[PDB]
Structures are given as C-alpha cells and as structure tokens.
Amino acid sequence: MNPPPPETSNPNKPKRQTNQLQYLLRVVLKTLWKHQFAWPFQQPVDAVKLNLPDYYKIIKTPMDMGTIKKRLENNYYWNAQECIQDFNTMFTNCYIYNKPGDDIVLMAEALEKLFLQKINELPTE
C-alpha cells in the first residue's frame, strides 16, 4: 500500500526565494531530470505499481525529484540547504532500500555524483 506523497505546500511553513534556490531548480534539478538514469526518481515510488509492498515498511522519509521540483516551484523551502537535504534523502533511501551493485543503486550513485558536481559551486546572494 502507498502512503500519501510528501507535501509540496504547507501554509504554516514560511516560504523563501533565494538565488541558490532558483539555481537549484533551473540548473541542478532540470539538468539531472534529463539524465538517462533520472526516470526512477522523477515521481514518488508507487509500491503497488512496482510490486514493492515493503518499500514503505523500510523507507520512512520518502523523497523524489518530482516532489523536489514541485517544492521548488512553490517556494516551499527556506534555503538551498533544505532542498539539498531532500536530494540527499532521496539518494540515501535508494541505498537503504536496496544493496550495493543493484542497477537502481548504480543509477543513484551516478546521479549523486552529478548532483554534487553541480552544487559544488552555487551562486551568491
């Protein structure tokens, strides 16, 4: 069974736009999105579709790039570090749910390297 997907809006939570968050959407996310290994990560894991009935028994903080994209588009985040944390959660979830050497892990490893390359230098305020 699937839990509800992570929120992409929250009226109690303050919004912010920064040069770094704009870059995270326009450059980092939109470039990673086009990578040949991005497709498993473009939407929340559908455990019913994918026949992964234990996915959410293992992964308690799910995250994916579709959620991140909507959060960025909604100015959901306070700062770039909060968004970067969601990317890191997405990658770590992949390593937790699977095991070294799996195809999906090789995909996450490649995307993580590209992500780090792109966030190594961010714009300034």
List of residues contacting ligand XUK (CB under 6 A) = 40, 45, 50, 94, 97-98, 103-104, 107
- Are 19 and 58 spatial neighbours (Cβ–Cβ below 8 Å)? no
For ligand XUK, the closer of residues 11 and 101 by Cβ is 101
State the burial class of residue 121 (Cβ atoms within 10 Å of its Cβ: 0-12, 13-18, 19+): exposed
Position with the least CB separation from ligand XUK: 40
- Are 68 and 85 spatial neighbours (Cβ–Cβ below 8 Å)? no
For ligand XUK, the closer of residues 44 and 78 by Cβ is 44
Find the shortest distance in angstroms from Cβ 11 to ligand XUK.
29
Contacts of 17 (CB under 8 A, 6+ apart): 75
For ligand XUK, the closer of residues 82 and 103 by Cβ is 103
- Whole-number Å distance between alpha carbons of 18 and 3: 31
For ligand XUK, the closer of residues 2 and 98 by Cβ is 98
Find the shortest distance in angstroms from Cβ 58 to ligand XUK.
10
- Whole-number Å distance between alpha carbons of 99 and 108: 12
Find the shortest distance in angstroms from Cβ 50 to ligand XUK.
5
